[PDB]
């Protein structure tokens, strides 16, 4: 990986805000205002347009398109599959779409919110090339910046490193980041350090395993391309579950509740400049196997399952299976912005048996 000279000036930058701690007229509440938002033809977005309905003062919708008929249509039926006709129909009334293509754009207003989720699709240039243009636009603005990222760019060590703790504090630990969407990810967040260090109103949060919401229809529109989804498929069908593999956390981070909690995040004026948005309640792959199959998983060899695995075509499977056995997971730190969330009467709901039960047999479902 690549680091600024200055990586030192953002770490302490990051590390002494998060000692501020809550301050007075600190959950002072700010005006989203009119607000740019990136990503809305995706899964967070769509939600993040319902949790901002009646708090911004107007949502516009950058939407990289061939024209604007067409960024319409994608936004449209981006919203139709997850809500009603009546509650898409009436969000419309507060969406202003605006048409890029493959960023040096105007913009109908002064823009007082700009809101960073969801990436173009080394496609790591591309990417961080749309935080840098963001960050621009932000400048121009005067703009609270809430630029949305992954909890996946603190969550690999290697097996040899002791430290492996990640909290609000960290940014660099050594980390792996391997995969080049967590590495995109993360040049953003450096990227939008260094625009804080200069000045920029700029928070950054890290964000869990998107689910189905905890309360919503539990269609996600290319859910068959989701690694966890295909992952959780591959074992559902199974029959048991190996060694190294039962023993996996797995977190159910609801896109609803994330949505709201976001939104609800960036109208507050806490000094930190980093946020943990997951579920704090992660449970491990075969205890969920087991409260959903309503029968004990068999527990095989790492050998023996890789071998299942891999007579069953489970490609998919197996490539997780290979980025744990040589990887170390990280423990994730999430309680100062869990505390912060409290200020705000917000929480995360309780997940039941019934909704597991459900939801795996909507993949199950939409499968095969």
């Given at each position: 990986v690549a680091l600024p000279d200055n990586l030192s000036e953002?770490?302490?930058?990051?590390?002494?805000?998060?000692?501020?701690?809550?301050?007075?007229?600190?959950?002072s509440?700010?005006?989203?205002?009119?607000?740019?938002?990136?990503?809305?033809?995706?899964?967070?977005g769509a939600y993040l347009i319902e949790a901002l309905q009646g708090y911004s003062h107007r949502i516009y919708c950058f939407i990289r398109a061939d024209n604007e008929e067409i960024a319409w249509y994608k936004l449209?039926?981006?919203?139709?599959?997850?809500?009603?006709?009546?509650?898409?129909?009436?969000?419309?009334?507060?969406?202003?779409?605006?048409?890029?293509?493959?960023?040096?754009?105007v913009l109908p207003e002064n823009m007082d919110t700009i809101i960073h989720a969801g990436a173009r699709t080394e496609f790591e240039k591309v990417n961080v090339q749309g935080t840098v243009d963001v960050i621009r636009l932000a400048q121009q603005h005067h703009a609270r910046l809430i630029y949305v990222s992954t909890i996946s760019v603190g969550t690999y060590f290697d097996i040899d490193t002791e430290d492996v703790t990640?909290?609000?504090?960290?940014?660099?630990?050594?980390?792996?980041?391997?995969?080049?969407?967590?590495?995109?990810?993360?040049?953003s967040e450096l990227k939008v350090l260094e625009a804080v260090n200069n000045g920029l109103d700029g928070?950054?949060?890290?964000?869990?395993?998107?689910?189905?919401?905890?309360?919503?229809?539990?269609?996600?529109?290319n859910i068959k391309t989701n690694r966890f989804s295909m992952v959780?498929?591959?074992?559902?069908?199974l029959d048991c579950i190996g060694v190294s593999m039962a023993e996996m956390p797995v977190d159910f981070s609801f896109v609803d509740t994330t949505a709201r909690q976001i939104v609800a995040l960036a109208q507050v004026n806490t000094p930190q400049i980093i946020y943990h948005v997951l579920s704090p309640n992660k449970m491990p792959v075969k205890s969920l196997l087991e409260c959903v199959k309503r029968k004990e998983i068999e527990l095989v060899s790492d050998e023996s399952f890789n071998e299942i695995l891999q007579k069953q075509d489970m490609y998919e499977t197996i490539g997780l299976t290979s980025v744990d056995r040589e990887q170390q997971l990280a423990m994730i730190d999430t309680?100062?912005?869990?505390?912060?969330?409290?200020?705000?009467?917000?929480?995360?709901?309780?997940?039941?048996?019934?909704?597991?039960?459900?939801?795996?047999?909507?993949?199950?479902t939409i499968f095969n």
């Amino acid at each position: 990986v690549a680091l600024p000279d200055n990586l030192s000036e953002l770490q302490k930058i990051v590390m002494s805000r998060y000692n501020l701690g809550i301050l007075e007229d600190s959950l002072s509440h700010r005006p989203l205002g009119n607000t740019l938002l990136t990503g809305a033809t995706g899964f967070l977005g769509a939600y993040l347009i319902e949790a901002l309905q009646g708090y911004s003062h107007r949502i516009y919708c950058f939407i990289r398109a061939d024209n604007e008929e067409i960024a319409w249509y994608k936004l449209m039926t981006n919203l139709n599959d997850y809500f009603s006709e009546e509650t898409v129909e009436m969000m419309l009334s507060n969406i202003e779409v605006i048409v890029g293509d493959f960023d040096d754009v105007v913009l109908p207003e002064n823009m007082d919110t700009i809101i960073h989720a969801g990436a173009r699709t080394e496609f790591e240039k591309v990417n961080v090339q749309g935080t840098v243009d963001v960050i621009r636009l932000a400048q121009q603005h005067h703009a609270r910046l809430i630029y949305v990222s992954t909890i996946s760019v603190g969550t690999y060590f290697d097996i040899d490193t002791e430290d492996v703790t990640f909290s609000e504090a960290d940014v660099y630990k050594g980390q792996l980041l391997t995969s080049p969407y967590t590495r995109s990810k993360f040049y953003s967040e450096l990227k939008v350090l260094e625009a804080v260090n200069n000045g920029l109103d700029g928070r950054i949060v890290r964000v869990g395993n998107l689910t189905s919401p905890y309360n919503g229809r539990w269609h996600m529109r290319n859910i068959k391309t989701n690694r966890f989804s295909m992952v959780m498929n591959d074992l559902l069908q199974l029959d048991c579950i190996g060694v190294s593999m039962a023993e996996m956390p797995v977190d159910f981070s609801f896109v609803d509740t994330t949505a709201r909690q976001i939104v609800a995040l960036a109208q507050v004026n806490t000094p930190q400049i980093i946020y943990h948005v997951l579920s704090p309640n992660k449970m491990p792959v075969k205890s969920l196997l087991e409260c959903v199959k309503r029968k004990e998983i068999e527990l095989v060899s790492d050998e023996s399952f890789n071998e299942i695995l891999q007579k069953q075509d489970m490609y998919e499977t197996i490539g997780l299976t290979s980025v744990d056995r040589e990887q170390q997971l990280a423990m994730i730190d999430t309680t100062l912005t869990l505390k912060i969330m409290n200020h705000i009467s917000e929480k995360w709901p309780t997940i039941t048996n019934n909704w597991l039960y459900h939801w795996a047999q909507y993949i199950k479902t939409i499968f095969n």
